[PDB]
Symmetry: D2
Subunit: 80 residues, 4 copies
Amino acid sequence: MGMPVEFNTLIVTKGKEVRIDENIFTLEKDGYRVYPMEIPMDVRKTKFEKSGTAEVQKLQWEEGRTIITYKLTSLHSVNL
Amino acid sequence: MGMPVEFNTLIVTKGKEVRIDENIFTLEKDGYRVYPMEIPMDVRKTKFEKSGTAEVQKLQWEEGRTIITYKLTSLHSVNL
Amino acid sequence: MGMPVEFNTLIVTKGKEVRIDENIFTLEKDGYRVYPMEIPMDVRKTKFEKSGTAEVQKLQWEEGRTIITYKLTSLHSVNL
Amino acid sequence: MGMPVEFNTLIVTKGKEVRIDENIFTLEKDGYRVYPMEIPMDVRKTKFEKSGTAEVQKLQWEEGRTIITYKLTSLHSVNL
């Protein structure tokens, strides 16, 4: 018994995200996570500023892990 | 933001439940748990015979713990 | 924002389940549902008559719908 | 008979919040909501700017409604 899940309000890519297309990426997290779907949210490299905005297109759970596929809709402080 | 919760489908009272009225009890669990509300579910003393059926009337989270108030709607193998 | 989900404790196949292998099936539900993972639960044709027991191996969300892949571990009243 | 809940990442007080002490308020929402606990989040009057930061101290569910008690830790654009 006991179905544990984690609710996330932000996409934090530890530089481990993978692009499968032009603006859509995939991120694999440990544990069963719940991410707002179709809703725009903040994306960042580290838990600590803002790297951009994105919207999860798909979310799946399998073997204690969760992998999301999101569409990056904008970049924040893009230097230079 | 790393908000962990546990989903429970059954009420497991380690004999630590407290009755506040005639058929309604209160159970305190460790961690923020999610219990089906207004929905009837099984209640047992341990992981090892159905003790009855109940329905959560109230659920609260506070200081890493969760305390529920349920209404016992029936008893199972009530021995003589 | 507002991220709505539904917590299910049982697998109710309206006869709309599809087997992709020998004992593993796939069921598509409306809305983003949360099902206990790796945990055994009851499976029935309708909300009325247990058909068997199963365990969800994978769960995914996409376009307001949820599709689960479960492994049937046993059959209940298998008539002859 | 599913168990529907809504995940919120921000406190949106439609001007319907009530203070029970000096810096702690209480907000009643429709539906069973899940709010990050002990974790600081943004608070605003409407879904439109930032009114301050707060941290939920208690959360309860009862009769399809949810009422939270949060501690306001700071004010944003406090005019004058």
